[PDB]
Amino acid sequence: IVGGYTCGANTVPYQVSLNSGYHFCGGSLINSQWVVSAAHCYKSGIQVRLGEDNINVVEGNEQFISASKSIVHPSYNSNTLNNDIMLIKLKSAASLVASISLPTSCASAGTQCLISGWGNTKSSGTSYPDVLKCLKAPILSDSSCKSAYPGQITSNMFCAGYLEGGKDSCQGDSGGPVVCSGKLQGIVSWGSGCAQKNKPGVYTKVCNYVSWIKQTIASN
Amino acid sequence: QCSGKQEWPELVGERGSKAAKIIENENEDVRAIVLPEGSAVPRDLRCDRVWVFVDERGVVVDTPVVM
Ligand SMILES: [Ca+2]
């Protein structure tokens, strides 16, 4: 997260860290046994870390649980990142750290949201934080979004952030939450650089997938 | 903390395809991915990936790093 602020411990209880030896992506806990992340975060042998604040210091709220399976969306396109959504089942249920509710309707442009993660904090150069970082940012008009990334935005994506640059998600934030008024509306997905002018963040549109999520959980 | 060589300042100004080979030789745990400068990219964090951004002449435009 660049241009953000220190969330503070347990202020984002649904935030998850995906760890394969190192933190590589984020995720959102949607119930005691299931995490929502990005399809491009898929790998085998994911360990899910809940209740994290400082990912480099055990502080007391951590629950590290193996992923028993990771279901990538059937129509995920690894090249264009369309349908960039993945479900991870925990090997054992987490102790409820709390889940975030799914959306019942899509949010509109201009809506203020909370984006968070342990991603790089620099637009230029590199700095990876120990503690969880947060950013408040508005959803942008589908018009702005498409103009920023011509030929690349699908109906399953939205832009959020600041066209003037300086505040954005970044490498290490993928899979993580975009929450707007208590609902998970987005998944950190892609962008050109981080916090560059006219290059806002692009996010998976979670409201398009509520049905797939339910059905997938029920059959797995 | 990733493993092996992490950054290639010497490769700025070099041909992309040539830099990619050098990178992969000097750190056997990464794959080099040549992309046009300004290409959008996923926002995951990896210890096995090195983007190599090139201008329209295929010249390395910034320091490749593991990320
Ligand atoms: Ca910790």
Numbering used by the authors:
A (entry chain A): 19 to 114, 118 to 241
B (entry chain C): 3 to 69
Reproduce passages from the article.
Recently, attentions have been drawn to another member of the potato inhibitor I family from buckwheat seeds, BWI-1 (Buckwheat Inhibitor 1). Interestingly, BWI-1 has an uncommon binding loop sequence with a Pro at the P2 position and Trp at the P8′ position, suggesting a unique mode of intramolecular interactions between the binding loop and the protein core.
The structure of bovine trypsin in complex with rBTI aligns well with other trypsin structures deposited in the PDB database. Trypsin-bound rBTI has an overall structure similar to that of free rBTI, with both consisting of one α-helix and a central parallel β-sheet. When rBTI binds to trypsin, its P1 residue fits into trypsin's binding pocket and forms hydrogen bonds with trypsin residues.
